[PDB]
Amino acid sequence: NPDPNANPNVD
Amino acid sequence: SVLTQPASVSGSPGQSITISCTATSSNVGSFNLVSWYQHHPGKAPKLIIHEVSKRPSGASNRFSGSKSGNTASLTISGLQAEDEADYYCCSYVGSDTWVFGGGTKLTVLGQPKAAPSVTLFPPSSEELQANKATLVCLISDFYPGAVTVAWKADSSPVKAGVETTTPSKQSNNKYAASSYLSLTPEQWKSHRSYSCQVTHEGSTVEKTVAP
Amino acid sequence: QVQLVQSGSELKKPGASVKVSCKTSGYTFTTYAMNWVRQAPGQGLEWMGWINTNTGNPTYAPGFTGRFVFSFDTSVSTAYLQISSLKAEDTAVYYCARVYSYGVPFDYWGQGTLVTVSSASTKGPSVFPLAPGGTAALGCLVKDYFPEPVTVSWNSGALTSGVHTFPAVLQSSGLYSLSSVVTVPSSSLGTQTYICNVNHKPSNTKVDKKVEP
Hints:
- The complex is a heterotrimer of chains A (11), B (211) and C (213).
- With 11 residues, chain A is mostly loops.
- Chain B has 2 helices and 19 strands.
- In chain B, the strands form 4 sheets. In chain B, strands 2, 4, 5, 8, 9 and 10 form a 6-stranded mixed sheet that branches.
- In chain B, strand 6 and strand 7 form a beta hairpin.
- Chain C has 213 residues and is an all-beta fold.
- In chain C, 0% of the residues lie in helices and 52% in strands.
- Chain C is built from no helices and 19 strands.
- In chain C, strands 2, 4, 5, 6, 9, 10 and 11 form a 7-stranded mixed sheet that branches.
- Chain C starts with a strand and ends with a strand.
- The chains are: A little secondary structure (11), B mainly beta (211), C mainly beta (213).
- Chains B and C meet through strand 4, strand 5, strand 8, strand 9 and helix 1 of B and strand 5, strand 10, strand 12, strand 13 and strand 16 of C.
C-alpha cells in the first residue's frame, strides 16, 4: 500500500 | 487473471453502463490504486480513471469510478457511439508490479438488429483439378457483430478443416465474416451435400451446396 | 508535450530476434519509469514489466523472464525491448507506457509495435473462380498467400457497385486466404465478362482471373 504521490523511479 | 471483468457489456445510446472489476487476491492490499483505460482498435490505450475514482482532464466527465469491498466499478453515463471500445481495469499488486484485468468489450447498441446474409460456394472446377477442395461461406450484413459457424457433411457435423474469421465492420456499419472448409476432392464428392450454418442471436441461416 | 514514438512493424521467423524502440520527448527521460505492455491476438493487455530509468534495474513479470530484456539509451531518451528466441506465441502488439506515480500509472502510451512471428515464407496466391433473385453472385477465392496484404478489384476497377472483398483468414498453416464477391444482374451473364484483378505486392504477383458461368 504505497503512497499514490510516490514516484517508483527511485535512485 | 488477477482482476475479473465481465467479458462484454451492452448498452443503448443515452443509458449509463457499469463495468465491474473484482480483485482475486489480497496482493492488491488496500485496493486504492485502481486505474481504468479506454482502448480503441489501432490506437493506444487511454487513461480515464486512476486512484479508484480520480478522473483526469482530457477524459470526459461522463466516466466515473467507484469501489465497494474488493470490486472496482466503472460507470459511463450518457452513453455515446464513440464510447464503444475495450475497457481495462488495473491495480498495483505490491513489489513494484501492476496487473491488468481481462478487459470488457463495451457494445453501444446503436443500430437495429440484422440477421446475416449467407452465400456458400462449392469448390471451383480449377481447384478440383489441382486436387484440393475449399468451401467458401460468406457472411454479411449482420448486427451485432457476433456469429458462430458450424459445418455439416450431409447431416453429421464437421470441425476438422474449418477456418473462420472474426467479424469485421463493413462500410454500412454492419458486420461481415467468412468461413472455409477444406476437404479432399474425394470427400467433396463422397457426400450428398455440405452445409454452412450461421447462428446469430439464437437464429440460424443455413446454405447447402452439393457436387 | 509528452510523446512516446515506437518503431515500425516487425516480421520475424521463430528463433529470430527483435529490438523495439520507444523514443521519448517532452519530459526528462530519467525521472519516470518506462513500462511495457503486450496484447496478443484476441487477448487483453498483459503487463510485462518496467525498468528504472535511474538505476537501470529491470522488473520482469512472471511469463516474461528468460527471453526479454528492457534497456534504455539516455543519450537519445529512448527505451528498448529486445526478445530472444522468438516464438510464434510472441505475436502481439507491444506498447511502451510511462508511469508518473503509483497513483497515476500508464498516463502516456506509445502507439504500439506489431511483432509477427510466423514460420511461413513469402508465397503468391492461388486464385480460383467462384462461378455464379434475378441478381447472381460470383467471386474469386484468393488462396494460400503470405504475408498480408492482397488487393482485389473487378474489371480493372469498372465494377465498384455491388462488391464486397472480405478480410483474410489466417490458416493454421500460417498462410492467408480471402474472397471477394460481386452481386450482378443475371441477365448480364451472356458475354458480359467479369474479371477479378488480384495484386499481392509482397510476392510481386498480379492475377486477372476470368469468372465465367
